[PDB]
Symmetry: C3
Subunit: 307 residues, 3 copies
């Protein structure tokens, strides 16, 4: 059985713990594991723009001994000239894993349904699970055991980061709160999956429109841009509902005195997060970005040896 990573709950709590431990080991010894020596190939396909995911996967694959074939948005978007299933079958003959940033989750599901190699979600409309592996590695290295920590996410509660912080966070035993305005709440199916997974780990799920209540006592405060490129023409004012949820100094003062701040980047300073918070002593955004490299190398090692 081939293991894929299309959503955070694809890993059990025990498996997630294995990946996060390998991530810590690979951060210490970054070229000690060469499962892709040869080089073996890995597909890294971008239907959307990327800086952090592009650099971290391309270099991480190289440091595992492999060669990343990076496909840009200049190539014809996949699924136009042939079925995604046909593409997955041919790519499986060239590479040992397929890393793909795309739109609908169903596109990832289609490729994983027929690929003979692991398929990894490098960002979809619905989830960003490699980002949250790096977030969890960052939280662990700054706070220790993840179980019982309180994490609050602020902004659009139905975007990929909100969904993956729910799923990935409760898998780690984190008490996850999503603070979002009315009409921007997590997908019900994702919320229910996080609630079921939380039963197994002692975690919990909270969804609230009360930003100050979400910030109070939190160990980790997280936010993300409020609007994806596909939502810019959706007809909504996507600024006025979110301003109460801005991660600013006043909000940070409400959290635990030792709280840290995460943001997957790119940040739009002055919108979802302020300069004072992002450049202040609680910010862990640069270590978080670095840990994309280490966490994704661990994920690849782990999937490859189980597939």
């Amino acid at each position: 059985v081939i293991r894929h990573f299309l959503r955070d709950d694809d890993l059990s709590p025990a498996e997630q713990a294995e990946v996060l431990e390998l991530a810590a080991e690979l951060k210490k010894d970054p070229v000690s594991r060469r499962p892709l020596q040869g080089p073996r190939g890995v597909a890294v396909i971008f239907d959307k723009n990327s800086t952090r995911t592009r650099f971290s996967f391309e270099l991480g694959i190289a440091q595992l001994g492999g060669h990343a074939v990076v496909v840009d948005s200049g190539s014809t978007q996949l699924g136009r000239d042939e079925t995604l299933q046909d593409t997955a079958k041919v790519l499986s003959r060239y590479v040992d894993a397929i890393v793909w940033r795309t739109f609908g989750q169903e596109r990832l599901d289609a490729m994983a349904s027929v690929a003979t190699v692991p398929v990894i979600n490098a960002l979809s409309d619905e989830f960003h699970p490699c980002q949250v592996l790096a977030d969890l590695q960052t939280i662990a290295e700054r706070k220790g055991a993840l179980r019982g920590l309180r994490l609050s996410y602020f902004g659009d509660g139905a975007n990929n980061m909100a969904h993956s912080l729910l799923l990935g966070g409760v898998t780690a035993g984190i008490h996850v709160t999503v603070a979002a305005p009315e009409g921007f709440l997590p997908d019900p199916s994702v919320r229910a999956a996080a609630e079921r997974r939380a039963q197994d780990t002692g975690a919990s799920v909270t969804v609230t429109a009360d930003a100050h209540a979400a910030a109070a006592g939190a160990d980790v405060l997280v936010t993300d841009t409020w609007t994806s490129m596909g939502q810019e023409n959706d007809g909504l004012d996507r600024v006025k509902p979110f301003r109460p949820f801005q991660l600013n100094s006043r909000l940070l003062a409400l959290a635990d005195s030792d709280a840290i701040v995460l943001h997957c980047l790119p940040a739009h300073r002055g919108d979802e997060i302020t300069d004072a918070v992002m450049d202040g002593p609680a910010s862990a955004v640069w270590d978080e970005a670095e840990n994309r490299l280490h966490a994704q190398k661990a994920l690849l090692v782990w999937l490859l040896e189980r597939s």
Copy 2:
């Protein structure tokens, strides 16, 4: 004293056999040849979109120890800011071979006239010779000796795949048939070159509008998308009806991407005659063999 690969007949029958033998060796032992260790560079330039050619060349070059510099069609078109001859001279100072997917064959000829390193056609409007090397490797590993086999291509008989199956097929001793409607027949000078090469190998060339006759007794049945306007080609659809007419143990090939329901049906493409996935894999092995072979002769 420098060898290029712009069309299938650039290799003699004997040299094609050498490259195909190397392809089988490299498929068994994919990192056993490292002529590009260093790394030395290879340019891989795309004037137009690619999946299979991009992956197969980029990874194949890496597995020869080299480093492919992949130039995308999003980058400024080649020969727009300076002559192709100036580009060829400069690239020859950085890389040991130039792989190029373009349109007009005369562009490939211009590059190859001045480059001091091998130039390889990664797909042109006229030929797709690296695809046919992979096809020949696929046929060989399933049927053994190529000489005397019957291969039929169906559909648009005027495109690069039809031309290269003609030229590369007769170079291997294959009796090649193109089944195509009038107005979409092979270029006469390509057909004439194929008939000429066929005299040396025991091969032959047939061009027919009768898909049933072409399918009857065929050992290899091949098709490709119809446009690069569909009414003339429908009778040449590679479906279960035609396949039922072929020889026992016949192989089905399609260079990809496929438009399922047009030139080929799901039942044929997903059925037990289909070798389209091995065929696509063999782009990697056959192109590595081609590069090894060209580099040691250049």
Copy 3:
């Protein structure tokens, strides 16, 4: 230690430039003998503008130092739009050991270098092209030996990146540099003054003239470049008539030293700034010059990495 960047030619002292150029000759002889980036370690190579020579030379050179170039080209969204240049520089510094960047305004390079924790290298900007001039100096040294006291004349637009870098990099090597350009197209005053100060240290000199024949006479090296960059195509000027007298043609080359060599960074517009006869003739060193982008930039990277 401090972090050394290479944004303009004078970022290297004369002694430091000599070290880089010596390393360039050593690496040309033994191209895989230095592996500071083995691992591989990453290097970012970002192109806000098109390139062939800089793209191939940096991507392969980095690989031959053992590293892995992450090449970002113009189809990926332009840097500075999705997030600040400073945020980008901080993030890249966590993934790579150096940042190579072809961009527009020099101030954009200054912004990344202010926050980056790794060397930033100018791979061509509006104001300078210092990696080209390192390759030019390597080529001249190959052909002529000692650079000190040679006479080099550049012809064409006196205010573009190649004129500025030939001034600064040339006098840093002890070369007497002349820029021959029509009035109105003269070097930036602050670059001219900086080159005059640096020339005083090396015994070199700076000359700026509208007299192309006088600039060619006695020269050891004649250099030109295209007259018009993309950003100037719509500046309203006739950018042909003023530059015709400055064309590097056979008549001009005949006025220089009988063993003079000809350089051109490429791409060339044959028939405008240079003629076929000159570019394809025996004085032309343009192909060696292009090849030396590989060697000189490898030397630069080795040198910066060991000091950062």
